[PDB]
Design a protein around this nucleic acid. Sequence first.
RNA 1: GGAUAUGAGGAGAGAUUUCAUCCAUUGCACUCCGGAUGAAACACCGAAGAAGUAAAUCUUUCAGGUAAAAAGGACUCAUAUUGGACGAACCUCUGGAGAGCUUAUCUAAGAGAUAACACCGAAGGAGCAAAGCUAAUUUUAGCCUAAACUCUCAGGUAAAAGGACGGAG
Length: 92
Amino acid sequence: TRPNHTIYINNLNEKIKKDELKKSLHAIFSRFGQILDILVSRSLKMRGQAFVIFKEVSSATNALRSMQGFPFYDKPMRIQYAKTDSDIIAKM
RNA sequence: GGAUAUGAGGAGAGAUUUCAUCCAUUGCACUCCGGAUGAAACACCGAAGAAGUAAAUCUUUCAGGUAAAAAGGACUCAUAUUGGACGAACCUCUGGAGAGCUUAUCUAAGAGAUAACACCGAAGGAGCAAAGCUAAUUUUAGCCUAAACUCUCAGGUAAAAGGACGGAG
Ligand SMILES: [Mg+2]
Ligand SMILES: [Mg+2]
Ligand SMILES: [Mg+2]
Ligand SMILES: [Mg+2]
Ligand SMILES: [Mg+2]
Ligand SMILES: [Mg+2]
Ligand SMILES: [Mg+2]
Ligand SMILES: [Mg+2]
Ligand SMILES: [Mg+2]
Ligand SMILES: [Mg+2]
Ligand SMILES: [Mg+2]
Ligand SMILES: [Mg+2]
Ligand SMILES: [Mg+2]
């Protein structure tokens, strides 16, 4: 849990369409900064989880510190900093 | 060999894609990747029954099926029962699938012979399962072991021939 561009969100409802989930997240987080991508899947290992990459660390933090435990789909969002970006930012 | 019983062997082809609920999962990734049932969308198979035919495994795929398992399974063998040894071999007719009409050379070269790679499974051919019979304690060792399974020595991948199987006198 050490400041990063990408942040990790989990304990979110495990019955949503990967597309329609990607929707709601982009809709909620874009108001904090430039959302580069929302990585999500429905694989057993990566269920009920999501990532959101920002261009600047400062947008990742302001979203984190603010949107925490926010009631989203009858689940309190649990957000925290990632491990490593692995995109245009990391290795570039 | 038939017909029921039961034990045993028995192939093909989507571990597809959407979707409804149940069972698990708090999980830190940057190829898309958990089960259990159901209901649909094309794709595919030939081995319950079924329907065309004289009948059929040929042939249609309505029903049925599409990792292993599980169930299913034309056929195959073994005990038990019933009986026919005038649907039982033999002989004639004929329906009968699969997969290279690939290249080299012999003489003239799409044919055939021979080698080569690539296959197929239905003459023929080898190998087994339960049972069976021996035998040194659950262990068990052995030999005996059907088949369209298994394999592919011979055999076959355009026609002709062949052809397990089926029916017609
Ligand atoms: Mg059986
Ligand atoms: Mg745990
Ligand atoms: Mg058939
Ligand atoms: Mg018939
Ligand atoms: Mg059908
Ligand atoms: Mg039949
Ligand atoms: Mg065969
Ligand atoms: Mg033999
Ligand atoms: Mg035996
Ligand atoms: Mg041979
Ligand atoms: Mg021919
Ligand atoms: Mg003949
Ligand atoms: Mg044979």
